[PDB]
């Protein structure tokens, strides 16, 4: 039994080809995993609180309070794009391919090992290690999804990239049900804001505990475990951003006079006056038909209220945004109209020699141009008396109730009849692959997280924990402290994923931006003499296309 | 022709628009044209 090992170790990228533009991108990967024995034992419910910060006046949310159930188990999981792909391999996908389709996913675990630590006292101490055959490892994997769900990166504690370096899973946890309400506050607020907790509604409680649900293959080690392949169900994603904004929807007006000399300050003429132009329009009184005012088949994007926190069971939380900041060059900070900004560390950047610790941060803009730029928006009466007098219209400079930061733009919305937008572009390699789809019946039209969504059910996760041991002592069903033999165990892990894509084709006269090395990043790709690594972010949606 | 395939860890130089030549590709209001030269052998490979 022990005298064999059944596994293989693969990180490869192989391009198999078919007829007529359909190309299977088949990527594999693997990692080495080390796993501490969980120090706790029983399932554990905890409520976290920090209030001096919500106590002091102001501080809308610098934090809230949550309650979770911490299992001893731990989660090895896929669903990053740094687990399988390489910024070397990533190139040939995004330059040649206009679309993706998802197919199939599978995992297996092979050649487990279990070790042991015996800590001497009178010795220095030195740590003895004797490989233990008869100890055991637990593997619990469900394809039913019944037990509750998370992906992981809302943080990116996910498996480390590169396949020479080990990586660790993370302890597994999920939200419980409480109630909280929090009243506003600011610097000038007097009295008390009345911040209170609020127990738990007993009507609704979920303790979900996998040992009450899903089987568990147990392993001493010669043995392997393999999950069969569970397919996906999805819709494709476009790799090609849409530049045309509400200006480019239509046929442009006809110039009646064409300019002359080469070199430019040279401006053509619309050739008619503003009064006599001919065309369709929507407006209160038109002797005016402009490049601006005119009927367009529909809008693009939506103006959304930004930084508005609606209250609920958890009270304060942020209301997300589905668009990019494209067209707005003057508002940055981090992600002004919203540009999801990843913060990770020590594991996929902030080059791998970093003394102490400190997070890593980059604002990821959109490469899609849909203008939501709030500045330069206002409203008129229906009379259209031009030039307009200050008393008959609005500006972003006008308060609400006598305030300043608010313009009017913080309270607005449209979205309704004519709007549309493009599915959120995938990001890399801190992003996410697939996402489970909501349980209710109205099925939001997208997610500001994942590119792809299983419309039926997504494949599950892989849970693992060391098997317990006792020496001699015990009490039955006791939350007192039972002694233990400190151990740990390593197991290799493999993964496979299947893609389908189509080659794009030129039909333009122009070349198109690609990713490539230069001297801007000269070496962001090549290791540092201590072994340094980064894998800087890279923006992929590179391909402009027609829209309407 | 045959499609190449990655086997490296690095991306590779390609041709593309930038601002160096911002418009060497787009006509001039009189009808100007250039078609500036372009250097193509772009792909490094192993030798021995």
């Amino acid at each position, epitope marked *: 039994g022990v005298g064999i090992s059944t596994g293989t170790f693969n990180n490869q990228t192989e391009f198999k080809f078919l007829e007529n533009g359909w190309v299977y991108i088949t990527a594999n990967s693997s990692r080495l995993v080390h796993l501490n024995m969980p120090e706790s034992e029983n399932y554990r419910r905890v409520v976290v609180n920090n209030m001096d910060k919500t106590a002091v006046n102001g501080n809308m949310a610098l934090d809230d309070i949550h309650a979770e159930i911490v299992t001893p188990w731990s989660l090895v999981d896929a669903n990053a794009w740094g687990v399988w792909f390489n910024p070397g391999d990533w190139q040939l996908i995004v330059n040649t391919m206009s679309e993706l389709h998802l197919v199939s996913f599978e995992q297996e675990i092979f050649n487990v090992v279990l070790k042991t630590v015996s800590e001497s006292a009178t010795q220095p101490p030195t740590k003895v290690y004797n490989n233990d055959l008869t100890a055991s490892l637990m593997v619990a994997l469900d394809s039913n999804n019944t037990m509750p769900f998370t992906p992981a990166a809302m943080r990116s504690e996910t498996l480390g990239f590169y396949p020479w370096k080990p990586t660790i899973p993370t302890p597994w946890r999920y939200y419980f049900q409480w109630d909280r309400t929090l009243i506003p506050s600011h610097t000038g607020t007097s009295g008390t804001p009345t911040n209170i907790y609020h127990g738990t509604d007993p009507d609704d409680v979920q303790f979900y505990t996998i040992e009450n649900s899903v089987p568990v293959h147990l392993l001493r080690t010669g043995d392997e475990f393999a999950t069969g392949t569970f397919f996906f169900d999805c819709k494709p994603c476009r790799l090609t951003h849409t530049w045309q904004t509400n200006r480019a929807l239509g046929l442009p007006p006809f110039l009646n006079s064409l300019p002359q000399s*080469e*070199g*430019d*300050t040279n401006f053509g003429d619309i050739g008619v006056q503003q009064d006599k132009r001919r065309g369709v329009t929507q407006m209160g009184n038109t002797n005016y038909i402009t490049e601006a005012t005119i009927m367009r088949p529909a809008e693009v994007g939506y103006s959304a209220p930004y930084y508005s926190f609606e209250a609920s069971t958890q009270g304060p939380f942020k209301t997300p945004i589905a668009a990019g900041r494209g067209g707005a060059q003057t508002d940055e900070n981090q992600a002004a109209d919203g540009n999801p900004r990843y913060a990770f560390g020590r594991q996929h950047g902030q080059k791998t020699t970093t003394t102490g610790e400190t997070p890593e941060r980059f604002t990821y803009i959109a490469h899609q141009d849909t203008g939501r730029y709030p500045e330069g928006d206002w409203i008129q009466n229906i009379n259209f008396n031009l030039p307009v007098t200050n008393d008959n219209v609005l500006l972003p400079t006008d308060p609400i109730g006598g305030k300043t930061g608010i313009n009017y733009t913080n309270i607005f919305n449209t979205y309704g009849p004519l709007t549309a937008l493009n599915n959120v572009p995938p990001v890399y390699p801190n992003g996410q692959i697939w996402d489970k789809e909501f349980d209710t019946d109205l099925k939001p039209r997208l997610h500001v997280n994942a590119p792809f969504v299983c419309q039926n059910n997504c494949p599950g996760q892989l849970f693992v924990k060391v098997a317990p041991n006792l020496t001699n002592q015990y009490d039955p069903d006791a939350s007192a402290n039972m002694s233990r033999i400190v151990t740990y165990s390593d197991f290799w892990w493999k993964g496979k994923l299947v893609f389908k894509a189509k080659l794009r084709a030129s039909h333009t006269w122009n070349p198109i931006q690609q990713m490539s090395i230069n*001297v*801007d990043n000269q070496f962001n790709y090549v290791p540092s003499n201590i072994g340094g690594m980064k894998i800087v972010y890279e923006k992929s949606q590179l391909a402009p296309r027609k829209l309407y | 022709a045959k499609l190449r395939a990655s086997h490296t860890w690095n991306p590779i130089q390609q041709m593309s628009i*930038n*601002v*160096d*030549n*911002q*418009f*060497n*590709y*787009v*006509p*001039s*209001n009189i009808g*100007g*044209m*250039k078609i*500036v030269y372009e250097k193509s052998q772009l792909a490094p490979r192993k030798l021995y």
Partner: nanobody
Amino acid sequence: SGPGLVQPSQTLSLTCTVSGFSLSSYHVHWVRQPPGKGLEWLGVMWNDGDTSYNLALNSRLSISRDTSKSQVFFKMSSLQTEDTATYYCARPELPGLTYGVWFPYWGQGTLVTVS
């Protein structure tokens, strides 16, 4: 540019580093006499431009290295001199159209180029 006659090559370069706002595209090489003149204010190449007398063409990449070129030859028999080339470099035009207009500061006084 020169020196000196009748139409030799190159020798106009400044300034590195941090040569201005990269708007696609910008100036200013100072320009010109100073009593004149001059120079209807560079675009970006295929086709965006350009200056007011033929063979005055300008080209450069606004990325780093931030540089300039040529410039240029051109027709020098008029004994004119602008030998620098220093920046800030307001709004070019092309971009512009405020209307226009205005030009804050400059740098690096007299450089004179021979006839």
